[PDB]
Every structure is written in C-alpha cells, then in structure tokens.
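Agenda item 2: sodium ion complex prediction
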Amino acid sequence: PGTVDKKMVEKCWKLMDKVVRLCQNPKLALKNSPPYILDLLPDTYQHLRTILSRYEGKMETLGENEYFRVFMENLMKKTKQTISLFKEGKERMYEENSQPRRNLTKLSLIFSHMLAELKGIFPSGLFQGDTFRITKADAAEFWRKAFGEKTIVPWKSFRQALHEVHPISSGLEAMALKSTIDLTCNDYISVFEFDIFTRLFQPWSSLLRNWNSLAVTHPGYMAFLTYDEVKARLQKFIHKPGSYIFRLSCTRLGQWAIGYVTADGNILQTIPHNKPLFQALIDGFREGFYLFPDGRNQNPDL
Ligand code: NA
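Presented output:
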C-alpha cells in the first residue's frame, strides 16, 4: 500500500477522466439513477481536492495515513478495472442487460460506497478515522477492544476477531459475509463499513443470525435498489395487498427501506425507525401489512 504523493493523485485523475469519457458515450443510454458514475467521480474529485487542500504544508502526514494509502490504491485499482471492463466488453457495453454492463453497475455501487466511506473518514477533508463514532454500542465496544482506534483492518484479522465473539460456521459463510461487509471490495474492513453492517443487522447479540435470516435466505431481500425500482417491482403485485420487499439504498448506507402494497392498492415505502428490521417485519406481519415477501405466499418466521 504505497505512499500517496502528487503524481499518484494526478494519475488517479487521469484514470478517472478516462472512465468519465467512456461513460459519456451516448450509445450506453446511461441512466441517471443512483449510483450514477458520472456524478460520483466528479464528487470524488471534489472531496479529494478538499482533502489535499486541508493537508497543504503537511503532505507527509496525509501520504503516510494508512487509510488514505489503501483508499487511493483501491481507487486506482477500481478505475483501471472499469477501463478494462470497457476495453474487453466492446460492443456488449451497449447491450442494456449484458454481463459486462451488469459489471459496470456493480463497479458503480463500489464507487458510491467508496465516496461515502471517504466522506465518513475525512469529513470536511480532515482525517477523523480514529474518532469515528460507531452507532450501535455493543459494536462500538467490539471494535474498541479488538482494534482500538484503528480505522481499517485486513479482512483476516477482522474475521478472526469477529469469529471469537460471533462464530462463523464455514469458509463459505466467511466469504459471503465478506461480500456483505466489504463494501469497497478492497479486502479491508473500515470502521465505517463495520458501522453500516452492525446497524443493518442489529441487535449485536444475534448478529450473524440476523444477517442469515434477513439477507441470505429471506425472499424479501432486494439488496441495493432505488425507490423507483422498488415501486416497479411491487406494481406487479398491486392486486395483492400485503406484498412487500426491503432494500438497501446506496445514498443512505446503513438503513433499510421497506416497500409494501396497501389494501387500497397503493405502494408505500417506510424506513424502519427506532427498531431493527427484524422487529419491524415481525410487527409488520402481525399488523397485516408485510405478508407476502416479493409476492410469495410463504413468509419466513422470525
Ligand atoms: Na473494505
């Protein structure tokens, strides 16, 4: 994870420019829906300029920051990947549902997560990794005890530390867990990524069982969708009140949104308030609102 300097930063901007040009091609019909790479990359540029501005005079400090070195390396890696993706996908980049354009969507989410992480760790351009506030108290305690005030830890150490408190049953569960928590796909877990995961799958006391029940095996789980995609999916069940699904939002990391069909044949969306998703779904079934996950007749018991 190499030391960041002007020329690395400038190479980043040159690579980001190339991705921008690639995604401006009109034959992609690139829709504006979040995550929208054409906004994300300028926004990442602006926040990086802000960081560099704050560390004028102190460029040694910034460039030795462990979190920043890993972040910039990952940013260079993902933009190169995006550039390669275009070079080899060739004509299929213009097929809306091709596998190379589903890969572009996937990279677009990662750019979104990376920007969000960078803003959580460098609010206003100043490094605050070591004072980051973890939302759930049992999770904050776990981080502070295993990792102190580290901002980022390699996946292997994170897995080992977490296994001792929340046993992971197999190599396969470990990989699936890595895919859920390692939002930036850089083989590290930041305190920001750990915040998001423990918020989504609280209560801490049953952490991984909540994750299995909500995001591994639940037919209601949609992973990342927009409001509009949720509505369009539930439109097909407007005749079936009680049909519901739940989603993550790339613009509101760490919270759930539930969409459901009303007895009156409308679709409403609710954000779980001061309860875990787990409980909002139990209450929602009890009250007759969340009965048919993705329209299916069998609803998991929680
Ligand atoms: Na990561």
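Discussion summary: Residues 96 and 155 are 34 Å apart (CA to CA).
Owner for follow-up: CH.
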